[PDB]
Every structure is written in structure tokens, then in C-alpha cells.
Amino acid sequence: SGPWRDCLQALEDGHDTSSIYLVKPENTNRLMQVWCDQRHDPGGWTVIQRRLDGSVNFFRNWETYKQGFGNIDGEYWLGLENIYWLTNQGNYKLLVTMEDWSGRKVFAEYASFRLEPESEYYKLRLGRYHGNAGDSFTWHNGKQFTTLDRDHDVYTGNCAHYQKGGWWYNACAHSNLNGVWYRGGHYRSRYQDGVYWAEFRGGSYSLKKVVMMIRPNPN
Ligand SMILES: [Ca+2]
């Protein structure tokens, strides 16, 4: 309590309880609330996205993805502008944790994760992968962000109209973590628009719980 540059700075001053914290990145006056996961190894994780229970609508427009939406103690998207300022104050790694409907938990980690500015459509910059979920994000490396009202992908249509999220769509997605949460995992739709990570359970399986979290990775 009392704004922190990120969840790691809060942890370093003794707040090791996972909860809601106030964050203000360096070199900005941008204040935000975040959920800090201070338990997952090694602590200091700032949650930028979380799916858990289908309570929040992720089929949203650009301004909503820019500013952030959802419930900070539940499902939410932190906001492209907030994520930009966070990821540009140092080198941050990205950890994606995922759980299927049978209790299996896997992860994908990227040693660097940065977004370009809104002037560059929040283009994704991703570093090297390790994990046991398989790498379904690197296909999206270098792609701009796309929403239902702003097409910036390399598909001749708008991928958000089909995959139903806001995402760094290519043509269209190997991961669709801002897609439609389907109870029970297995689903069938005209288009694969679920919360999927293709290398783990494929495009027709919606993951029960997903977290995208970031933390300084200084080297
Ligand atoms: Ca397009």
C-alpha cells in the first residue's frame, strides 16, 4: 500500500500477500490497480490477464482493451496502456499459467515481453520460450494488437470477428487467451473462438483457468 513500480517492489518491502496493490510505473503518472501474485515462484508477479469462470466479457473494443476491464479480484484485462508503461521500465518476463478441466496445470514462460506504444498499435515483442505447455505464443511475436473495431492483423478479414478477443492476432491464432470461456473445456463452434492454447489441448478446448503475469527479469 502506497504505489509501487510493480508487484516485485511491493514484495521487496515486505508485502508477500497475494492481493490488490496500487502500481505506478517509473517515468509516468499512470496509476493502476493490479492483482499481485506473491506466491507463485519467486513472487513479485503482476497479473495482466486472468480467466477463471466466464464472468467477464472479453469481446470488447479498442478503447476498452486500451484502458482495462473486468474485476481486479476476478477475471480481468489490465489494459494495453498500463501494460506498455510497465513493460518499458525494465526487462520483464511473461509467465502464462494454464489449467484444463481435469486439473492439469502447465506453463509457458518468455524471458522478455514488451509492448510498443499505441502509435505502433501495441506491437508484441517476445523473447525466448521455455515451459511444458508448448509454445503457442511465438507465432504472434511481432504482431500488432487487433480488436473487433480495429483490424491490425495480417488476415484479409478481421480476426477478432472470428476468435472474439482482443489479441496480437496473426491469421488468426495459435493462442486465444482473450477468447470465449466454454464451460467444461470441449466445445464446437463455427470458428475456434475459445480460450485455447493450441499446443496444450488444441484449438477446440477452452482452458478453465489462465493467468498472464509479468515480473522483472534483470540480467
Ligand atoms: Ca486484417
**Experimental method, per PDB record:** X-ray
Give the number of domains in the chain. 2
Q: How far apart are the CA of 191 and the centre of ligand 1, in A? A: 16
- 3-class SS of residue 144: coil
Q: Which domain holds residue 151?
A: 134-208
Dist. CA 13–CA 4, nearest whole Å = 10
216 and 196 co-located in one domain: no
17 and 116 co-located in one domain: yes
149 and 128 co-located in one domain: no
Q: How far apart are the CA of 36 and the centre of ligand 1, in A? A: 35
35 and 47 co-located in one domain: yes
Q: How far apart are the CA of 150 and the centre of ligand 1, in A? A: 9
Q: How far apart are the CA of 41 and the centre of ligand 1, in A? A: 38
Spatial contact of 125 and 134, defined as CB atoms under 8 Å apart: no
CB crowding 140-167: b at 16 or more within 10 Å, else e: beebbbbbbebbbbebeebbbbbbbbbb
Spatial contact of 66 and 83, defined as CB atoms under 8 Å apart: no
Q: How far apart are the CA of 119 and the centre of ligand 1, in A? A: 18
Q: How far apart are the CA of 194 and the centre of ligand 1, in A? A: 20
Q: Assign residue 202 the CATH number of its domain.
A: 4.10.530.10
78 and 53 co-located in one domain: yes
Q: Name the resolution in angstroms.
A: 1.8
17 and 121 co-located in one domain: yes
Q: How far apart are the CA of 153 and the centre of ligand 1, in A? A: 4
Pseudo-torsion of CA 56, 137, 147, 91, nearest 10°? 90
